[PDB]
Amino acid sequence: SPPVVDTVHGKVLGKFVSLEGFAQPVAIFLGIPFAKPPLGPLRFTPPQPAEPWSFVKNATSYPPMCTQDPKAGQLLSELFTNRKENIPLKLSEDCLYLNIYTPADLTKKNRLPVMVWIHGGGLMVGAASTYDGLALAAHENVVVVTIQYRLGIWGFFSTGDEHSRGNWGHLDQVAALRWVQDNIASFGGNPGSVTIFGESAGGESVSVLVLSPLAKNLFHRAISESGVALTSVLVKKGDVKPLAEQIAITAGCKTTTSAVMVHCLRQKTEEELLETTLKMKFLSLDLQGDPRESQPLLGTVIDGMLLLKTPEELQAERNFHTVPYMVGINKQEFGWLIPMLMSYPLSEGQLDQKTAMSLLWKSYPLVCIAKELIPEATEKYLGGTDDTVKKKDLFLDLIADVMFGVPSVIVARNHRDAGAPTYMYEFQYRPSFSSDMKPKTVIGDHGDELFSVFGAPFLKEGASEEEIRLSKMVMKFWANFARNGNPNGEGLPHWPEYNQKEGYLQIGANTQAAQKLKDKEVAFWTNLFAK
Amino acid sequence: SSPPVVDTVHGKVLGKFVSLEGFAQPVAIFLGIPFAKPPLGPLRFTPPQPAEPWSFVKNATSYPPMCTQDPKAGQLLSELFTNRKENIPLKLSEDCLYLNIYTPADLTKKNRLPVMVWIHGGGLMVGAASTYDGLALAAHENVVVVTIQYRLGIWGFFSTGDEHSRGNWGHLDQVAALRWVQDNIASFGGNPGSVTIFGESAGGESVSVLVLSPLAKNLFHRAISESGVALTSVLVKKGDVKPLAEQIAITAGCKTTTSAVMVHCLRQKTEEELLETTLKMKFLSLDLQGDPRESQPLLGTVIDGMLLLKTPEELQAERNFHTVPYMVGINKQEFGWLIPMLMSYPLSEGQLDQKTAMSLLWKSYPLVCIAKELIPEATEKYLGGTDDTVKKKDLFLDLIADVMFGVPSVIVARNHRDAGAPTYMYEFQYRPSFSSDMKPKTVIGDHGDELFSVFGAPFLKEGASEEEIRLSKMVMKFWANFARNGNPNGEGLPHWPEYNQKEGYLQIGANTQAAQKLKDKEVAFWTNLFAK
Amino acid sequence: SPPVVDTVHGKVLGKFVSLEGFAQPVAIFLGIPFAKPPLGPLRFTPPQPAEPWSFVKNATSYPPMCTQDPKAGQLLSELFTNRKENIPLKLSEDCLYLNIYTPADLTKKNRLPVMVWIHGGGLMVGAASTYDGLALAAHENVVVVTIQYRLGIWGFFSTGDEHSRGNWGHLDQVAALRWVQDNIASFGGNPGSVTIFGESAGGESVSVLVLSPLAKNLFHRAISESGVALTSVLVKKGDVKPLAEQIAITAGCKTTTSAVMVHCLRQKTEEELLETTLKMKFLSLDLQGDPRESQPLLGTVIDGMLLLKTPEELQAERNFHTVPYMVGINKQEFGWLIPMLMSYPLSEGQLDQKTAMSLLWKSYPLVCIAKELIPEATEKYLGGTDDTVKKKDLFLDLIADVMFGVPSVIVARNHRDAGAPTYMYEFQYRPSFSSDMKPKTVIGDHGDELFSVFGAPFLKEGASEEEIRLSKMVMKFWANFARNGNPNGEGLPHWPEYNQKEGYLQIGANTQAAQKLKDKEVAFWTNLFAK
Ligand SMILES: OC[C@H]1O[C@@](CO)(O[C@H]2O[C@H](CO)[C@@H](O)[C@H](O)[C@H]2O)[C@@H](O)[C@@H]1O
Ligand SMILES: OC[C@H]1O[C@@](CO)(O[C@H]2O[C@H](CO)[C@@H](O)[C@H](O)[C@H]2O)[C@@H](O)[C@@H]1O
Ligand SMILES: OC[C@H]1O[C@@](CO)(O[C@H]2O[C@H](CO)[C@@H](O)[C@H](O)[C@H]2O)[C@@H](O)[C@@H]1O
Ligand SMILES: CC(=O)N[C@H]1[C@H]([C@H](O)[C@H](O)CO)O[C@@](O)(C(=O)O)C[C@@H]1O
Ligand SMILES: CC(=O)N[C@H]1[C@H]([C@H](O)[C@H](O)CO)O[C@@](O)(C(=O)O)C[C@@H]1O
Ligand SMILES: CC(=O)N[C@H]1[C@H]([C@H](O)[C@H](O)CO)O[C@@](O)(C(=O)O)C[C@@H]1O
Ligand SMILES: *[C@@H]1O[C@H](CO)[C@@H](O)[C@H](O)[C@H]1NC(C)=O
Ligand SMILES: *[C@@H]1O[C@H](CO)[C@@H](O)[C@H](O)[C@H]1NC(C)=O
Ligand SMILES: *[C@@H]1O[C@H](CO)[C@@H](O)[C@H](O)[C@H]1NC(C)=O
Ligand SMILES: *[P@@](C)(=O)O[C@H](C)C(C)(C)C
Ligand SMILES: *[P@@](C)(=O)O[C@H](C)C(C)(C)C
Ligand SMILES: *[P@@](C)(=O)O[C@H](C)C(C)(C)C
Known part of the structure; x- marks a missing residue:
């Protein structure tokens, strides 16, 4: 018998689904509207509250993903999805929806922790439906909410002034959080314990929210996976006109x-x-x-509503609600996926110094390294070997450090020094669900942790016991963080706190604490970028 | 000798005088008074908004446009229904939320006459207010007649089945008009405390629906449905409208x-x-x-959650709705000629045999909604009686008529009676002389025939016999008495029994008299059939 | 360092511009929004408040001029500009802006009299940028504010009823005056002493505002230069449908x-x-x-909002907040500029009684003289001689008396008879900045006083000492009127108040007082039109 919940704007009808082995069914709701469709005159304006509906609203079919490149969009979905078969998606401006996965017994009054997921896709592509919350919900007994937000032009067109301030996509995320605050209890969720987490552009969003005084009060814990407000390619600085x-x-x-x-x-x-x-x-x-x-994408700006100053200036201001914050990266963030998606000229599998320098310049929009600094940077990473293959790999390491490693560590340190509980990790594992086109030597590629976090091993086929083990461990870590703001718990390897010692957890086949993640790197880049 | 100027909440309005043979006081007629903001652009598919007030004097002296509709079908229906000498051609427009007022009072005095708000028909698809001239009814009964318009077809009833487009825009327009009457009718010599809403066909269904709507409670004090009610299933969409x-x-x-x-x-x-x-x-x-x-015959009323919270069938049994005197009536041959002729029915031969009858009834699903399995029973019960092909054709027409109007009307009336409110019924049987030449002379009490008596066609059109003039005078008296008292009875009229447990109704025609248990058998049969 | 002011809607950044002869630089702020852009659904509706902005708005570039005939608008801009080089403008519906010239030292607190200028252009063309308030502001120490308002179809389209009453352009002028009341103090101006002035359609706007209850208490002094509410061509009476x-x-x-x-x-x-x-x-x-x-232009209508009755009915009604009003005209209002802009068939420089009567009839939309009265009128003016060239010039003084001369005197008389301080003047000078295509005999042509009022001699090149002194005198007269409601002041010739003696000031090479301006003319026309 179909589960029916009363939301602030009307009743919604869901469906029960069982994950092999679990007696408690999972109530799934698809396409709940949390804002009014941003159509016509509503385009390039803040999201507005949804109009209440009369009878029972069937929330049983996948909502459209926001308008985006259909090729790149369908491609990213197929690569990041944790469900057996990728679901085809429709495109529409009418996309402000969210999906709910709750393991709570709706016939009673549960208050389970809530984990709100914010997908990635460079703020240009992506969708909520790509991530199925079934396994994480059933396995850790938490409510999972996948949300959507306007993308590209629709979500970030800014004129740098009052006529189109910008950051619509971020305001869309804030609206969803507010919706969670007002409705989650009806889905067995505890509005007093909401955790936001997302990867890449979703991680940058989490980071942005964490620094935004507007979002303060809408979440209690945050997790940024391979993406923070200091991942420069996502934040436009200067004149956006x-x-x-x-x-x-x-x-x-x-x-x-x-x-x-x-x-x-x-x-x-x-x-x-x-x-x-x-x-x-x-x-x-x-x-x-x-x-x-070259503008690789439209993104976050300093609009004066969501962000009043640059992410950098906001950190040194120790002015932002301090909530437990988990920040992590993957061993090879620029290992395959991203260069593949952006069509990097690495067809040869090799790279010599001069070509690396030219490439690094071309990559300006991603790493913003002044042309006169190229020799120092390239020399620092590639100068130690004559193996053209290792130079290409170290070249990929160079990019990953400037885009994710250094920014993430710099963020964690500031959060920490601000007085709030901070935690770091570095994922290094090669999921079997990887694309066939991805070289087998790539381990810990961008997005690889999504399969452990979202229990792909329990929704897809072929996971070895080792992979299944890694997934369970990762979900308990994330969920433990959800409820206590501390990933630690009985039966899991100790995860030190990121204090002045800078301990962090290395996750993979072998998981164990370690210290001073990317220390030399941050030193090298802060110094180089100072010149 | 000087045009009449009335001050309303939204501004001053200028009408004109028109005299009628037999009355000293000219009637003040105001045409095209706006009662809502033109539902253009972003306002399409949304409730009606209040009209902007204006400065100076607005000229309400020309007929307003009729809501966008099939111009051909609309002119035809207007010509077969108009009670004036010559049908008035109209323009089409989305800007159509207007109403016409015909007041017999002397606007130099303080009159408080009963008001009768007319809601035209036309299957919620076509129709217009200008079709009906209230001159005669207003003068003959000293009542204020107000004819209103409302969005039609797509504009008035497009429904996605959810909040983005609930629907019933046309019904909300009717409510907005009634609200207008309540705030302004006193300036036209009317009594806001005594408003009667009446209409026929889709107009009768509108009235019926308003009686069941919490949105209209307190905007009218008496209702009259002529050939059409909430159970006239063809006009009410039940199910998934998506x-x-x-x-x-x-x-x-x-x-x-x-x-x-x-x-x-x-x-x-x-x-x-x-x-x-x-x-x-x-x-x-x-x-x-x-x-x-x-096959979808039209876009109609739906259960939206605003105007109607549940299906009509449910709302009646609820005994939950402001009760007001309600008059429900039908004509002797609702499906006699006009409807079939308009919907283009395959009866070109005048003959119909059982086989062909069962097919036709199946094809008429959108009109009578009878499961293909029930067809045989229903057809045998009506056509089995004889073997004359022509008589079968006629009995078939009485079959359609009982399913679309006859039975529903009586069910609505019984439930209204059982709900504890004054109910009255009638059955009009007469062949106006204004009838179309292409109408079989054997047809008496066709759809829309009582419109000529009610709106006093004999006093505008030409050649009416003293018999037809007298039927008109009697009907207007009954209608107007009902308007002012909730009871049609008055001096100089045959006794109209109330529709109590004895189920006595009035047979109106050349010989008007009381009778009992109208369509009692038919109701029994059909209720029993649809009970599968 | 650029001047920065705090307004209700946000901070604005300007620029300092020094003027030869004054130590204190004048702060200039260009294109400050005073209404929301009248786009989309806002077209043909009252102006709305401007959306507030974050950070600092850079008010340093000329705003677009309201959509209009670009060829006619540039021409009029060139003929009327007081700066050396005319500034080319872009067209847009997003034109509700104003420019401010404040000679006040924004570091201290100043309460300087404010002068709000309303340009002309028959309500069909024009721009505020054409007028530089640098000279006036610096020389007479007043805050100069040039405004813009919707033109043509955009600013005056009227269906004659509630769906589009009209006078949007006039409602814009009123919105700009409210802005002044709410923000001018921040610019060193005194909202308690605002003088509205303009010429031609601008003159008629001021006249209209003096009669409108929508504008009462938004200004304290008025000046109509060659244009009033009785200037028939700008006010539509009757069925506008x-x-x-x-x-x-x-x-x-x-x-x-x-x-x-x-x-x-x-x-x-x-x-x-x-x-x-x-x-x-x-x-x-x-x-x-x-x-x-024939309809020469879209103009002012009796909407029931701005004007409840016709200008004539409102004057004798003695019902309109009284303020010191100055009404003036130029010696030859129809001397060159207007006939040229409207393409008058005066290609021969001569005119015979017959042709004269033809034109006077064709000129109906301007003078509104019924065909039967043409003879009585043509005879009165041209009948004096036989000289075809002398006739052509009388015909022009015939058009000028009907359009500006008579209308002005009447307006001034009624204003006076209502107990309000009144002042009149006739401008009789030929600026050296005249166009080359202009006959040298024309003195005091339409708009000729502009060069004096806006101190063109201190911005353009080649002004003789005579012209320079005339401008200095005119600006003081104007500024004194602005601060006192009386133009007189030490060193300036005596300007009599227009009382029963009907005294006025003749301005030009020799400035002196005189009496009963256009007396005969008014008498003749009042009588004629009575037929
Ligand atoms: O993409 C074509 C082809 O290039 C190879 C080298 O032959 O891989 C290079 O490009 C990848 C991204 O497109 C990088 O991830 C990889 O590190 C780099 O060597 C092949 O592996 C690939 O099929
Ligand atoms: O001109 C009308 C003509 O139509 C006929 C045959 O087509 O009547 C049939 O169709 C009518 C409506 O179209 C029905 O009202 C009628 O009952 C049916 O027999 C002729 O009988 C009539 O003269
Ligand atoms: O451009 C027309 C041309 O006409 C002349 C005489 O040839 O002047 C007449 O027309 C002018 C309109 O442009 C009037 O202002 C003037 O008063 C009239 O004599 C030339 O001067 C002028 O170039
Ligand atoms: C037309 C469409 O595809 N939309 C779906 C809608 C809403 O959009 C939900 O929010 C899911 O997105 O739900 C329905 O089930 C419903 O309410 O009857 C219809 C359909 O399945
Ligand atoms: C003065 C006024 O506003 N009324 C006008 C009416 C209104 O539309 C009424 O609402 C409908 O009679 O229609 C006209 O414009 C028209 O085109 O025939 C004439 C009239 O001037
Ligand atoms: C984009 C542009 O060059 N125009 C300018 C406009 C103006 O306000 C008006 O468009 C013209 O006055 O916006 C600014 O003032 C602003 O908000 O910073 C500066 C900008 O340089
Ligand atoms: C929603 O569910 C109801 C009943 O389960 C069904 O009638 C309706 O058609 C569904 N929505 C759709 C797909 O139209
Ligand atoms: C029609 O309305 C106009 C208002 O524009 C009014 O002047 C006129 O008198 C009206 N028609 C007549 C002749 O009554
Ligand atoms: C206003 O701010 C500075 C100050 O002059 C200026 O350089 C900049 O161009 C303006 N802002 C914009 C529109 O970038
Ligand atoms: P993420 C996968 O959402 O976006 C990348 C970090 C980028 C390089 C900006 C496309
Ligand atoms: P009414 C004549 O307005 O409409 C009929 C009842 C219908 C069958 C819907 C055309
Ligand atoms: P003003 C120069 O703005 O316009 C003239 C008075 C006109 C004659 C209407 C062109």
Whole structure:
């Protein structure tokens, strides 16, 4: 008999599903609206509250993913999904929905911890439905909420002023959190213990929320997986007006004033703005053209509502709610997936110094390394060997450090020094669910931890006992953090706290504490970037 | 000698005077008074908003446009229903939320006359207020007659089945008009405390629905449904309306990703575009081939949660709704000629044999909703009686008529009676002389025939016999007496029994007299049949 | 260091500009929004408050001029600008801006008198940027504010009823005055002493505002230069519906109803409405067709909001907050500029009684003289001689008396008879900045006083000592009126109050007082029009 819950705006009908072995069924709700569809005049404006509905709303089918490149979008979904078969998704501007997976007995009044997931995809692609919360829900007895937010132009078009401040996608995330606060108890969730976690752009979002005074009170714990507010490619610093003009022109709009641009873009069709998106060619390494002018994506800006100053200035301000914060990275963040997605010219599998330097310059939009610093950086990472293959790999290590390693550690340190409980980890394992095209030597590639965190071993086939073991351990760690703000618990390897000693957990076949993660690196980059 | 100027809440309005043979006091007529904000652009598919107030004097002297509809079908129905000498041609427009007022009072005085608000019919698809001239009824009965318009078809009833487009926009328009009457009618010499809503067909269904709506409680004090009620299933959509909404969206060239998307896309179509979409859907017409259960005759009333919280069938038994005197009536031959002729029925031969009868009844599913299995019983019960092919054709017409109006009307009346409210019923049997030449002379009490008596056609049109004039005078008296007392009885009229347990009704025609248990058998049969 | 002011809606950044002769630099803020951009659903509706902004708004570039005939607008801008080089402008519907010139030292607290300028252009063209308030502000130590308001179809389209009452352009002027009341103090101005002044359509706007209850208490002193509410060509009386339908059809809109028309027009792009504007051929003399049907422009209407009754009815009504009002005219208002802009058939420089009567009839939309009265009028002016060249010049003084001369005197008389301080003046000078295509005999042509009032001599090149001193005198007269409601001051010739003696100031090479301005003319016309 279909589970029915009363939300603030009306009743919703879900479905029961059982995970082999668990007696307690899991109540699943799909496509619950947490805001009014941002259509027509609502485009490029803050999300507004959803209109209440009368009878019972069937929440039993996957919501559309926000408008995005269908090729790249379907591709990322197939790569990150933890469910047996990838589900086809529709595209729409009407995408402000969230999915709920609750193991609570709805006939009673449960108050289980809530874990809100924020997907990645560079703020350009991605969807909530990609991640099935069944296993994590059943296995750790927590409520899992997958949320969506506007992407690309729709979610981040900014004119740098009041006519289109920006960060709509982040405001969308804040709206979902507020929705959780007002409705989660009805789904056996405890609104007083909400944990936000997400990877890549989702991790950067978590990081942004953590620094935003607007979101303060909507969550109690946070987890950033391979992505923080200091992952520069995701945060636009400076004048965002030129980008706005570039988009407006591409879409066939006048650029007389900001209001004109926004009004014009508001009158273009969804399908028309998708074409402008394809023309801009985001998430792709531009091989010709001043690298200092390529915009790999539209992102987070300093709008004056969500963020009042740069992420950097906000940290040194020790001004932000201090909640337990887990920040982690993977051994090889730029190992395969990202270079593959952006079409890096690494067809050869080799790289010599001069070519690495040229590549590093081309990669400017991702690492922002001034042309005069290239020799020092490249020399520091590749100079130690003559093996052209190892240079290519160390080259990939160089990128990962500037985009994820150093930023993540710098963030953790500031959170820590601010007085709040902090924890770090470095995932190093090669999931069997990896793509067939990914070289077998890549271990701990971007996104690899998603399979352990979301229990892919229990939803997909072929997991060895070792993989199944790693997954369970990881879910208990995440869930333990969810309830106590401390990942530790009986039967799990000790996870030291990230204090001045900087201990962190190395996760993989062998999991054990260690210290001073990326210490030399942070020293090298903070110093180089100072010049 | 000087046009009448009335001050309303929203502004001053200027009407004109019109005299009628037999009355000294000219009637003040005001045409096209706005009672809502024009439902254009973003307002399409949303409740009606209050009209903007205006400065100076608004000229209410020309007929307003009629809501977008099939211009051809709309002119035809208007010509067969109009009570004036010559039918008045109308323009089409989305800007159509207007009402016409005909007051017999002297506006230099303080009159407080009973008000009668008319709701035209036309299957919620076509129709207009201007079709009906209240001049005669207003003068002859000293009552204020108000004819209202409301959004039709797609504009008035498009429903996605959920919050993005609940539907019933046309019904909400009717409510908005009644609300307007309550705040302004006193300036026209009317009594806001004595408003009677009446209408026939879809108009009768509207009235019936308003009686069951918590949204209209306290906006009217008496109701009259003529040939149409909430149980006239063809006008009430029961089930999942999502599929129809999608068939409409696709026919208009819209995506159907979600409801919000459908509504957003339809809101951007032009009136001509939505009009073409209307024509392609072929509403108000019987489809001869394919599956009958899938053919959609029109967009109608739905259970939205605002206007109607449950199905009419449920709301009646609830004994939960402000009770007001209610008059429910029907004509002797509802499916006699007009409806079949309009919906283009395959009765071109005048003859019908059992086999052909059972097929026709199955094809008429959207009109009579009878499971293909029940067909035999229903057909035998009506046609089995004889072997004359022509007589079978007639008995078939009485079959359709009892399913669409006859029985529902009596059920609605019984439940209203059992709910503890004053109920009255009638059965009109007369062949107006204003009838169309293409109408078989054997047809008496066709659909819409009482409209000529009620609106006093004999006093506007030409050639009425003293017999027809007298039927009209009697009916207007009964209607107006009901308007002012909730009881049609008064001096100079045959006794109209109340519809109590004895179920006595009034037979109106050349010879008007009381009778009892109208359609008692039919109700029994059909209730028993639909009980499968 | 750039000046930064705090306004209700946010901080604005300007720039300092020094003027030869004054130590204190003048702070100039360009393009400050005073209303929300009137786009989309806001077209043909009252102006709305501007959306507040975060951070610092850079008010340092000229704002667009409201959509208009770009060829006519640039021409008028050039002929009227007081700066050396005319500044080319961009077109936009996003034009509700104002420019501020404050000579106050924003570090201290100043309460300087404020002068708000309302440009002209027949309500069809014009811009605020054309006028530089640098000279006036610095020389007379007042805060100068130039504003903009919707023009043509955008600012005056009227269906004659509630669906589109009209006078949007006038409602904009009122919104800019409220802005001043709420923000001017931050710029060193005194909201308690605001003087509104303008010329031509700007003159008529000021006149209208003096009669409107929507504007009472938004200003304390008024100055109408060559334009008043009785200047027939700018005020539409009677059924305006015909013009509305004519515009709708020209734009390809059904005329079914008022609401339907306005709705259709609201869906037209700026380009489409501009094309309609051009086809309508406004501000141009129509040679062919019934003069009683030609419509030179879209103008002020009796909407029931801004104006409850016609200007004539409101004057004798003695019902309108009284303020010191100054009404003036130029010696030859129809000398060159206007006939040139409207393309008058005066290609021969001569005119015979017959041709004269033809034009006077064709000129109906401007003078409104019934065909039967043409003889009595042409005879009065031209009948004095036989000289065709002398006749052509009298014909011009005939048009000028009807359009500006008479109307002005009457307005001033009624204002006076209502107990309000009144002042009149006749400008009789030929600025050296005149156009080359302008006949050298023309003295005191339309807009000639502008160069004196805005101190053109201190911005442009080649002004003789005579012209420089004239401008200095005019600015003091104007500024004294601004601070006192009386133009007189030490060193300036005596300016009599326009009382029963009807004294006025003749301004030019020799500035002196005189009496009964246009007395004969008024008498003659009042009497004629009575027929
Ligand atoms: O992508 C083509 C092809 O290139 C190889 C080397 O032959 O891998 C390179 O490119 C990958 C991303 O596209 C990197 O992850 C990898 O490290 C680099 O050597 C092949 O493995 C791949 O099939
Ligand atoms: O001109 C009308 C004509 O139609 C006929 C035959 O087609 O009547 C049939 O159809 C009518 C409606 O279209 C029905 O009312 C009628 O009962 C049916 O026999 C002729 O009988 C009539 O003269
Ligand atoms: O451009 C027309 C041309 O006409 C002349 C005489 O040839 O002047 C007449 O027309 C002017 C309108 O442009 C009037 O202002 C002027 O008063 C009239 O004599 C030339 O001066 C002028 O270039
Ligand atoms: C047309 C469509 O596909 N939308 C789905 C909707 C909502 O969109 C839910 O929120 C799921 O997204 O739910 C339904 O089941 C429902 O309410 O009857 C219909 C359909 O399954
Ligand atoms: C003065 C006024 O506002 N009334 C106008 C009416 C209104 O639309 C009424 O609502 C419908 O009679 O319609 C006209 O405009 C029209 O085009 O025939 C004429 C009239 O001037
Ligand atoms: C984009 C541009 O170059 N125009 C300028 C506009 C102006 O306000 C108006 O468009 C014209 O006055 O916006 C600014 O003021 C601003 O908000 O920082 C500065 C900007 O340089
Ligand atoms: C929602 O569920 C009800 C009953 O389970 C069903 O009638 C309805 O059609 C469903 N929604 C859809 C797919 O239309
Ligand atoms: C029609 O309305 C107009 C208002 O524009 C009014 O002047 C006129 O008198 C009305 N028609 C008549 C002749 O009554
Ligand atoms: C305003 O801020 C600075 C100060 O002059 C200026 O350089 C910048 O261009 C302006 N802001 C914008 C629109 O970038
Ligand atoms: P993430 C997978 O959401 O985005 C990447 C970090 C990027 C390099 C910006 C595409
Ligand atoms: P009414 C004549 O307005 O409409 C009929 C009842 C229908 C069958 C729906 C056409
Ligand atoms: P003003 C120069 O703004 O406009 C003139 C008075 C006109 C004659 C209408 C062009």
